[PDB]
Structure 1
Amino acid sequence: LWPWPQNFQTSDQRYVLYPNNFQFQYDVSSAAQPGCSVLDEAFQRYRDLLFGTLEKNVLVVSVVTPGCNQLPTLESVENYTLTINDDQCLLLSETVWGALRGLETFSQLVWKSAEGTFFINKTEIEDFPRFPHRGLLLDTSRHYLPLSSILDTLDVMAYNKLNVFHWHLVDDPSFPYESFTFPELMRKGSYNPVTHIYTAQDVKEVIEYARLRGIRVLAEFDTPGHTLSWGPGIPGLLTPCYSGSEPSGTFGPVNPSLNNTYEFMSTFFLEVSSVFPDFYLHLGGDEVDFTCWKSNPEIQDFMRKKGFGEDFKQLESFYIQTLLDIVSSYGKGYVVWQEVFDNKVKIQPDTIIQVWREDIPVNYMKELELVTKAGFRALLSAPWYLNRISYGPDWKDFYVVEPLAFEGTPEQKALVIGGEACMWGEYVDNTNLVPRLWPRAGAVAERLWSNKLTSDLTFAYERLSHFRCELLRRGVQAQPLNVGFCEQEFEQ
């Protein structure tokens, strides 16, 4: 089992399963019934994974009705109970998304002996996630990622019970997103206007694919920093840096002193809010350099009119405030990096802050304290930067992290809604994504789902390594934790 359930009562009493004659059926009592897109496909997908006294059936009953066509939200309940004994074999979930979790848990409990016989132990489970926001970040800018690689990642996120896909579509070196409101962004920003592109068809497939797995799609079009690929296509958007008197070629962050800029963002983010159905959008706001703005004389003049002065922290605030209003008018929530909070930017009470920095300006645990005491919600990602590789089993570092290990009151700590693992693509693409992702990302997966008390490294290794071999069986190219072997070694 991975991740480890909140309440799992095991036994040694076993039952025999039948690969072919095993079927998933709804209970007449259930809210979700034949026609439930999510579960119909789930039953099919899981029977392929498993089989691609005795038990022939598995009853699935959802109490909360809310269809199977509407996408998951931050408020969605993932509670479920797995009851398997002599009398019954029932999977009782509160919602449709809890059933998905239940099926995954069920899939890992199915085992086979040295004879090859399929079995299933007498089990009683009462499970639920510790945090509602369990995400994983992919950087499709520094290196383009084929649609197949993204869909594969979503398949494994489902195995680890991760429910948020932090899509970092664009950045400095590449703009692979194809915009229909501004077609020049993709045509002159992407590495290649044809082969390395994300169409409207690609995006809607990701969303629906993720939806079937009960995964939210958090889109991030980082602004005003990390926007070098925006330059060409939409002229005048970026800030032309200065040497002193005349401009010297290089461009900086988005120019917040032009009317053209705000009418562009209003039109562009209208599309973004239309394409991505999720309630929240990530607006970035990280690593914003004030150097290029200060050097520019035309921008220096702008701050004297509005009366900001010498601090660009409130100049940045002016940009983000306006940007938040635009996105807020479309009925969209928003997540933002920690810089926005650190730079005292006028911010809406419902904004979520994502802690990513380790030491500067303050320790990441001290950050969660400030953000929560300030009243805002927070995501933790600081110690979960998978892109930062090191020798040995650093998954133990990720696993031992305690998100609520800071100074605060019960309700203050309740503002922490989870976190995300981050795979920045500076040194990662289609060639080494999977092995570098899993099963290191599984360490974060369990820490965000399981209970505070599940922390034994020895117990973690046993299950994670066992889960690692299972991943390989499912076709996942996951790297080894340490010396050892899987009977079915990876070979494709």
Structure 2
Amino acid sequence: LDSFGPINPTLNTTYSFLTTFFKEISEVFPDQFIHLGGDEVEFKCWESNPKIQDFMRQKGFGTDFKKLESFYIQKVLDIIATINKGSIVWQEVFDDKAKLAPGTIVEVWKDSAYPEELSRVTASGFPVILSAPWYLDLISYGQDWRKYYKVEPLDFGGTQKQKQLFIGGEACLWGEYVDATNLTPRLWPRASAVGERLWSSKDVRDMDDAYDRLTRHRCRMVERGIAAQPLYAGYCN
């Protein structure tokens, strides 16, 4: 329906480009991990392409484009492993049955049944990062800092071993409706709710006390040049 779709995973020029490209990235960014993405891959374009249809039957993927996605992603993960970096991946890569090397971090972003996603990912042995309940781009009326604060990330089903695989989370501010004019007030102090939940003890959840310290903290951010938005009616100083 569009003009161009996803990266063409059947061409050797693709993987040759990605090799050279990711090698540059392994040098520019010193962090051990590179996020390869893998979210929301559309198959309609691959399905409608004759050369891809040919490639699909060449190795028995039938009409299952999850296998072509897996095939693509496995080659990229292998490129990351060869340059001695770790890989992070959005949950779709795990859900669509790609073969991930041990160590691969899976970032859980889909808000539907996310605890059960956490169980599945951890049960399969993989380290997990949670972002699903902390989509700060999804704005709403009122004190939504509380709903982010009330999340207890380890309330999913699993053994201690699985819960040890939960390494943390991220508060996400996607950019469709965000730029320099509105980023800071949208981000802070709503992201401060997630920061306490990820830093402080599990049992730190008194809402009144959280409100008391966060308004004062927010005023502190403002004093330091961060235009963090209010929690409710009031003033600073």
TM superposition score normalised by structure 1: 0.48
Query: 1:322, 1:457 → 2: CA distance?
Result: 47
Identity of aligned residues (%): 62
Query: Using the alignment, how far apart are the partners of 2:161 and 2:13 within structure 1?
Result: 43
Partner residue, 1:67: none
* Structure 1 residue 407: Cα displacement: 1.1
Q: Which has the larger radius of gyration?
A: 1
Q: In the alignment, is residue 353 of structure 1 matched against residue 103 of structure 2?
A: no
The counterpart of 2:97, out of the listed 331, 344, 362, is 344
Which of these residues, 3, 12, 15, is aligned with residue 259 of structure 1?
12
Deviations 1:156-203 (A, max 9, x none): xxxxxxxxxxxxxxxxxxxxxxxxxxxxxxxxxxxxxxxxxxxxxxxx
The structural deviation recorded for 1:371 is 0.6
Given candidates 289, 297, 319, the residue that maps to 2:72 is: 319
The residue that corresponds to 2:54 in the other structure is: 301
Partner of 1:365: 115
Task: Decide which structure has greater strand share.
Answer: 1
Summarize deviations over 1:275-320 as a string: whole Å, max 9, x none.
0011110000000111110010110000111221110111111111
| Residue 221 of structure 2 is aligned to residue 471 of structure 1 | yes
Q: Which has the higher helix share?
A: 2
* Aligned position for 2:172: 422
SS of residue in 2 equivalent to 1:445? helix
In the alignment, does 2:236 pair up with 1:483? Answer: no
Task: Let me know the Cα RMSD of the aligned residues.
Answer: 0.9
Which stretches of structure 1, 4 residues or longer, exceed 4 Å deviation after superposition? none
Output one character per residue of 1:188-233: Cα deviation in whole Å (capped at 9) or x when no partner.
Answer: xxxxxxxxxxxxxxxxxxxxxxxxxxxxxxxxxxxxxxxxxxxxxx
- How far, CA to CA, are the matches of 2:102 and 2:80 in structure 1? 15
Of 318, 329, 334, 2:82 maps to: 329
Unaligned runs of 5+ in 1: 1-240, 242-248, 488-492
Which aligned pairs between 1:369-380 and structure 2 lie closer than 5 A? 369-380=119-130
Task: Spell out, residue by residue over 1:418-468, the C-alpha distance to the aligned partner (whole angstroms, 9 max, x if none).
Answer: 000000010000000000000000000000010010011111100000101
Q: CA separation in 2, counterparts of 1:306 and 1:256?
A: 13
Mapped pair 1:402 → 2:152 = yes
> Per-residue deviation at 1:372?
0.7
Equivalent residue for 2:206, pick from 445, 456, 469: 456
What is the match of residue 276 of structure 1?
Answer: 29
Structure 2: state its 5+ residue gaps. Answer: none
Is residue 386 from structure 1 mapped to residue 139 from structure 2 by the alignment? no
1:357 partner amino acid? K
Deviation for aligned residue 1:410 = 1.1
**Correspondence for 2:43:** 290
Letter in 2 for 1:365: P
Distance in structure 1 (CA, Å) of the matches to 2:11 and 2:121: 32
Aligned residues: 237
TM-score when scaled to structure 2?
A: 0.98
